[PDB]
Design an enzyme around this catalytic site. Structure first.
Site, PDB file in Angstrom:
ATOM      1  N   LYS A   1      40.756  52.210  34.605  1.00  0.00           N
ATOM      2  CA  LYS A   1      40.302  51.032  35.333  1.00  0.00           C
ATOM      3  C   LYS A   1      38.839  50.815  34.953  1.00  0.00           C
ATOM      4  O   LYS A   1      38.084  51.777  34.841  1.00  0.00           O
ATOM      5  CB  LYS A   1      40.410  51.284  36.842  1.00  0.00           C
ATOM      6  CG  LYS A   1      39.611  50.312  37.718  1.00  0.00           C
ATOM      7  CD  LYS A   1      40.173  48.896  37.678  1.00  0.00           C
ATOM      8  CE  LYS A   1      39.291  47.918  38.449  1.00  0.00           C
ATOM      9  NZ  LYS A   1      39.833  46.524  38.433  1.00  0.00           N
TER      10      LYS A   1
ATOM     11  N   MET B   1      40.237  41.135  42.622  1.00  0.00           N
ATOM     12  CA  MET B   1      40.051  42.520  43.039  1.00  0.00           C
ATOM     13  C   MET B   1      38.613  42.885  43.377  1.00  0.00           C
ATOM     14  O   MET B   1      38.370  43.602  44.344  1.00  0.00           O
ATOM     15  CB  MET B   1      40.575  43.476  41.963  1.00  0.00           C
ATOM     16  CG  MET B   1      42.057  43.331  41.644  1.00  0.00           C
ATOM     17  SD  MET B   1      43.136  43.460  43.085  1.00  0.00           S
ATOM     18  CE  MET B   1      42.959  45.191  43.489  1.00  0.00           C
TER      19      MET B   1
ATOM     20  N   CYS C   1      34.907  40.363  33.117  1.00  0.00           N
ATOM     21  CA  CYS C   1      35.245  40.525  34.514  1.00  0.00           C
ATOM     22  C   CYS C   1      34.297  39.526  35.180  1.00  0.00           C
ATOM     23  O   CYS C   1      33.080  39.615  35.036  1.00  0.00           O
ATOM     24  CB  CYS C   1      34.992  41.956  34.992  1.00  0.00           C
ATOM     25  SG  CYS C   1      36.027  42.428  36.408  1.00  0.00           S
TER      26      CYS C   1
ATOM     27  N   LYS D   1      36.684  43.505  25.641  1.00  0.00           N
ATOM     28  CA  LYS D   1      37.715  42.767  26.367  1.00  0.00           C
ATOM     29  C   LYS D   1      37.129  41.381  26.584  1.00  0.00           C
ATOM     30  O   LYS D   1      36.116  41.223  27.274  1.00  0.00           O
ATOM     31  CB  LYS D   1      38.004  43.442  27.709  1.00  0.00           C
ATOM     32  CG  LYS D   1      39.068  42.759  28.565  1.00  0.00           C
ATOM     33  CD  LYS D   1      40.453  42.852  27.943  1.00  0.00           C
ATOM     34  CE  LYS D   1      41.542  42.432  28.930  1.00  0.00           C
ATOM     35  NZ  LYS D   1      41.677  43.385  30.073  1.00  0.00           N
TER      36      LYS D   1
ATOM     37  N   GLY E   1      48.314  39.559  27.839  1.00  0.00           N
ATOM     38  CA  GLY E   1      48.568  38.293  28.498  1.00  0.00           C
ATOM     39  C   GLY E   1      49.998  37.805  28.424  1.00  0.00           C
ATOM     40  O   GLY E   1      50.496  37.475  27.348  1.00  0.00           O
ATOM     41  N   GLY E   2      50.654  37.762  29.580  1.00  0.00           N
ATOM     42  CA  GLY E   2      52.021  37.276  29.657  1.00  0.00           C
ATOM     43  C   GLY E   2      53.087  38.137  29.016  1.00  0.00           C
ATOM     44  O   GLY E   2      54.173  37.646  28.713  1.00  0.00           O
TER      45      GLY E   2
ATOM     46  N   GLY F   1      49.772  43.781  32.074  1.00  0.00           N
ATOM     47  CA  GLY F   1      49.115  43.767  33.366  1.00  0.00           C
ATOM     48  C   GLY F   1      50.072  43.422  34.489  1.00  0.00           C
ATOM     49  O   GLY F   1      50.704  44.299  35.076  1.00  0.00           O
TER      50      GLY F   1
HETATM   51  C1  LIG Z   1      45.187  43.472  39.771  1.00  0.00           C
HETATM   52  C2  LIG Z   1      44.508  43.221  38.434  1.00  0.00           C
HETATM   53  C3  LIG Z   1      43.290  43.858  38.150  1.00  0.00           C
HETATM   54  C4  LIG Z   1      42.595  43.692  36.947  1.00  0.00           C
HETATM   55  N1  LIG Z   1      41.380  44.348  36.690  1.00  0.00           N
HETATM   56  C5  LIG Z   1      40.869  44.375  35.354  1.00  0.00           C
HETATM   57  C6  LIG Z   1      39.842  45.281  35.029  1.00  0.00           C
HETATM   58  O1  LIG Z   1      39.323  46.075  35.837  1.00  0.00           O
HETATM   59  N2  LIG Z   1      39.392  45.259  33.696  1.00  0.00           N
HETATM   60  C7  LIG Z   1      39.882  44.436  32.713  1.00  0.00           C
HETATM   61  O2  LIG Z   1      39.454  44.463  31.566  1.00  0.00           O
HETATM   62  N3  LIG Z   1      40.891  43.574  33.078  1.00  0.00           N
HETATM   63  C8  LIG Z   1      41.404  43.536  34.371  1.00  0.00           C
HETATM   64  N4  LIG Z   1      42.438  42.654  34.650  1.00  0.00           N
HETATM   65  C9  LIG Z   1      43.023  41.783  33.733  1.00  0.00           C
HETATM   66  C10 LIG Z   1      44.130  42.457  32.837  1.00  0.00           C
HETATM   67  O3  LIG Z   1      43.620  43.558  32.127  1.00  0.00           O
HETATM   68  C11 LIG Z   1      44.829  41.470  31.915  1.00  0.00           C
HETATM   69  O4  LIG Z   1      43.784  41.104  30.968  1.00  0.00           O
HETATM   70  C12 LIG Z   1      45.440  40.218  32.693  1.00  0.00           C
HETATM   71  O5  LIG Z   1      46.102  40.569  33.872  1.00  0.00           O
HETATM   72  C13 LIG Z   1      46.191  39.383  31.680  1.00  0.00           C
HETATM   73  O6  LIG Z   1      47.454  40.139  31.448  1.00  0.00           O
HETATM   74  P1  LIG Z   1      48.879  39.905  32.186  1.00  0.00           P
HETATM   75  O7  LIG Z   1      49.303  38.517  31.853  1.00  0.00           O
HETATM   76  O8  LIG Z   1      49.859  40.899  31.628  1.00  0.00           O
HETATM   77  O9  LIG Z   1      48.659  40.127  33.656  1.00  0.00           O
HETATM   78  C14 LIG Z   1      43.160  42.829  35.940  1.00  0.00           C
HETATM   79  C15 LIG Z   1      44.377  42.185  36.223  1.00  0.00           C
HETATM   80  C16 LIG Z   1      45.072  42.364  37.444  1.00  0.00           C
HETATM   81  C17 LIG Z   1      46.384  41.632  37.644  1.00  0.00           C
END
Ligand SMILES: Cc1cc2nc3c(=O)[nH]c(=O)nc-3n(C[C@H](O)[C@H](O)[C@H](O)COP(=O)(O)O)c2cc1C
Ligand SMILES: Cc1cc2nc3c(=O)[nH]c(=O)nc-3n(C[C@H](O)[C@H](O)[C@H](O)COP(=O)(O)O)c2cc1C
Ligand SMILES: [Mg+2]
Ligand SMILES: [Mg+2]
Lengths: 311, 311
Positions: free
Chosen positions: B43, B69, B130, B164, B249-250, B271
């Site tokens: 995280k 978050m 972030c 990122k 993503g997705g 994610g």
């Molecule tokens: C609950 C939650 C917490 C997240 N916290 C972070 C984080 O601490 N650091 C980071 O680089 N991305 C964070 N993200 C973003 C994800 O790493 C990812 O880039 C984003 O959810 C897009 O992917 P997905 O479509 O599979 O959800 C978070 C996403 C979610 C849903």
């Protein structure tokens, strides 16, 4: 129950087509006039007629659409002549909206000057967000250039003017843009144009689905509603009350419309859904929104306009 | 079939969790280690432990998720100690990834210095997206500030480092970022973090669904795949080959994974789907991707990696 006041004008309901959809020709426009739409807007025009990008350039997707039209349009003079003739007839409740998307600041200024000099009494929408123009960066993402253009525009344009904006994804950007926009006598802000340069792939053929720009195109539909609502809401809480908002993005059902209105939108534009369903969509969505209002005991949009609640 | 080489390291498959999901505690990390994931990442951490934003701050949506978050994490030292201890065990195929998201440049530099000085032999991911400190932007939306930070970072950080990034929506922005990133000995770029500041509304309650920031939060899931794929592809055709890409993503199905790989991603992060399904998702998606490859007669990701076809 949907009677709306916008830009000091009266409309039967807030629904309109989104520029680019069902508004290319006079025939298209006449069909929108005949529909239940509260108002309509012309296809963004350029000084010269444009054929647009190579096909395929628009594809229906399960969750929306992707396109890279390339600003195909019949030219500024064509649309100006239509609206000017239509204006004299007084056979419509509410002014027509005229969209312009010049290929350069000089082109936009030229078209705005022509509109200003003409007898056009309707509303003009300056497109600062077309994401499908080959080699042309969405102007509204360049805050300095945007402010510079608007300052020049308002040194002479006195008629109703709104700006079609691309989606923003950072609160500081909303603050910056709001600060810029609030210094002008703008009639409205229209959020949002497509989420720019997205990509859709056919896994079977291992290829993109649109020809221009290696498959990259503007995304519309359900994919973008969260972004659209956020933009409408973010500007609603930052713009001076003199600048109203048109909500565009992911509107397909009465519920989607209700959500945009709750955020602060006054007028609502339908793109992708209208492209798929045709003008009959207006009668359907109007009834859906009215049903939602009836269930809640609302008789006017004012009963919930901009009343989105925070937790 | 899915064997992957990334950052000069070998992984059984390209799948990983996306930072922020299922990686808060040592127990979470151990569950990812026990799963079929090819690799995992911690995280995003800050120097001090953080409780994060008020609840509700995460909500599952039909087309994805929305969250704010607030960077809740157990602190830099907690994660560094975990990775340093597991490193000695040599009980894992492929290095662990360590994400950092300082709230100030000074904080990021401090953490990178600690990592550099430690015996950490894994991979580090610097989170420049972030949507952290109000009055921001997301650092990666400030090209000047991003380049300035990276220049300082590379004056001392010699270990594997990736960044990122938030999603971009204009081709010129990809050109600008690529030019900036190509001057550094970066190991990779991870596209994309959530589509920032979206909004989801409960029409019945006429309210937002998350408590922080008046309901505005990062959007993930199906909503963002077009944007995610576009970012992976746009960077794949602009970045020097020395800088690999992690696609995020997705990603929910083997088809989604296949699409990211076709675009040019080498590693893949999950994610939202992982948040909903748990670590069992890795075994499922691995089998789905393998089935797609078997049908096409592919025995290695190299058979289609980055081969997305234009029309
Ligand atoms: C609950 C939650 C917490 C997240 N916290 C972070 C984080 O601490 N650091 C980071 O680089 N991305 C964070 N993200 C973003 C994800 O790493 C990812 O880039 C984003 O959810 C897009 O992917 P997905 O479509 O599979 O959800 C978070 C996403 C979610 C849903
Ligand atoms: C085929 C097509 C053409 C478009 N052309 C224009 C245009 O010329 N001017 C403009 O301001 N927006 C244009 N847009 C964007 C829409 O006006 C609207 O902002 C977008 O589609 C988001 O709405 P939706 O989710 O209802 O589709 C176009 C959209 C589509 C689908
Ligand atoms: Mg009518
Ligand atoms: Mg394992």
């Amino acid at each position: 129950m949907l009677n709306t006041t916008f830009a000091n004008a009266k409309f039967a309901n807030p629904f309109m087509n989104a520029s680019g959809v069902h508004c290319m020709t006079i025939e298209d426009l006449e069909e929108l006039k005949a529909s239940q739409a509260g108002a309509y807007i012309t296809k963004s025009s350029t000084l010269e007629k444009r054929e647009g990008n190579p096909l395929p350039r628009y594809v229906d997707l399960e969750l929306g659409s992707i396109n890279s039209m390339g600003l195909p349009n019949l030219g500024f003079d064509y649309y100006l002549d239509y609206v000017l003739k239509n204006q004299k007839e007084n056979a419509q409740e509410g002014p027509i909206f005229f969209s312009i998307a010049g290929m350069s600041a000089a082109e936009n200024i030229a078209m705005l000057k022509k509109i200003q000099e003409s007898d056009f009494s309707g509303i003009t929408e300056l497109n600062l967000s077309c994401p499908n123009v080959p080699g042309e960066p969405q102007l509204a993402y360049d805050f300095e250039a945007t402010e510079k253009l608007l300052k020049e525009v308002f040194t002479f344009f006195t008629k109703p003017l709104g700006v079609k904006l691309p989606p923003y994804f950072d609160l500081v950007h909303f603050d910056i843009m709001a600060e810029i926009l609030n210094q002008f006598p703008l009639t409205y802000v229209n959020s949002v144009n497509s989420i720019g340069n997205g990509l859709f792939i056919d896994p079977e053929a291992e290829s993109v689905v649109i020809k221009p720009k290696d498959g990259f195109g503007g995304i519309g539909g359900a994919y973008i509603k969260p972004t659209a609502l956020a933009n409408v809401r973010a500007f609603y809480t930052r713009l001076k009350p003199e600048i109203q908002i048109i909500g565009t993005g992911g509107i397909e059902t009465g519920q989607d419309a209700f959500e945009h209105l709750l955020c602060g939108a006054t007028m609502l534009q339908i793109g992708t859904a209208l492209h798929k369903e045709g003008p009959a969509i207006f009668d359907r969505i109007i009834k859906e929104l009215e049903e939602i209002m009836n269930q809640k005991g609302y008789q006017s949009i004012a009963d919930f306009h901009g009343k989105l609640k925070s937790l």
